[PDB]
Amino acid sequence: GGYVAPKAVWLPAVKAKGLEISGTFTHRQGHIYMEMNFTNKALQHMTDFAIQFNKNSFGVIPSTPLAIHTPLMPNQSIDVSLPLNTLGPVMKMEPLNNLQVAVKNNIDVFYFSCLIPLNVLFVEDGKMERQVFLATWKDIPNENELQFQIKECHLNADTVSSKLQNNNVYTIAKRNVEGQDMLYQSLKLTNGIWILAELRIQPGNPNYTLSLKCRAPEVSQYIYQVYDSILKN
Ligand SMILES: [Cl-]
Numbered sequence: 001g002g003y004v005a006p007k008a009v010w011l012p013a014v015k016a017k018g019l020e021i022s023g024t025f026t027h028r029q030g031h032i033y034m035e036m037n038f039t040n041k042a043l044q045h046m047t048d049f050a051i052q053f054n055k056n057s058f059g060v061i062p063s064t065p066l067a068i069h070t071p072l073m074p075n076q077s078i079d080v081s082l083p084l085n086t087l088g089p090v091m092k093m094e095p096l097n098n099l100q101v102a103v104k105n106n107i108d109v110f111y112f113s114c115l116i117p118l119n120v121l122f123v124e125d126g127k128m129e130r131q132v133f134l135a136t137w138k139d140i141p142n143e144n145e146l147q148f149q150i151k152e153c154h155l156n157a158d159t160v161s162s163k164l165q166n167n168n169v170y171t172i173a174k175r176n177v178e179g180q181d182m183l184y185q186s187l188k189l190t191n192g193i194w195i196l197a198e199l200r201i202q203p204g205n206p207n208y209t210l211s212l213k214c215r216a217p218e219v220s221q222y223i224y225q226v227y228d229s230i231l232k233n
């Protein structure tokens, strides 16, 4: 299984007439979930739960109604797994991975936003053939290449590769070049956009250089972020 961030408070009870939501996102065998905990810190029973998202960069929507079937009584706390997909309307948000959410119950409708970690959008079929990798890297404009630093990393190339693989980031080739390990990696988003990467591991340097090439370079910063998280967790 890939990296899953710990649940964070998305909607505090005091801003939502007692409704408290905490959440995170996961990806389970090709399926994306918004995993939440709803707690009723009010003095009335809560019913009639419903959820919707604003249009967003990767076209993320719930794929079913929110599965809360019984009144959530005062002091009660339930875990809710909401399946998502990427078939919904697309509107480019800033930041690119922001998701606006509305949750309703019988008391009111409440709004909050949260940030989607892009690794849940990394698809299973994201392993480029070596031949295709080289050709695609070359095809993408050199100006699209962006460099980032994975600070303070001490994992071996092998471990880097295995962890990334667990998050559908595939190592296509490894080059040993005078002690340095150069890992060439591919991944593919739910929207079809490929991201190619060169990770440079040097002896004595506690920082790895991650070089990313993408036809949509605005995405790169976000791949870096979760790449960093996967290596640090
Ligand atoms: Cl719903």
Ligand SMILES: [Mg+2]
Residues within 6 Å of the ligand: 124, 165, 166, 167, 168
């Ligand atoms: Mg996989």
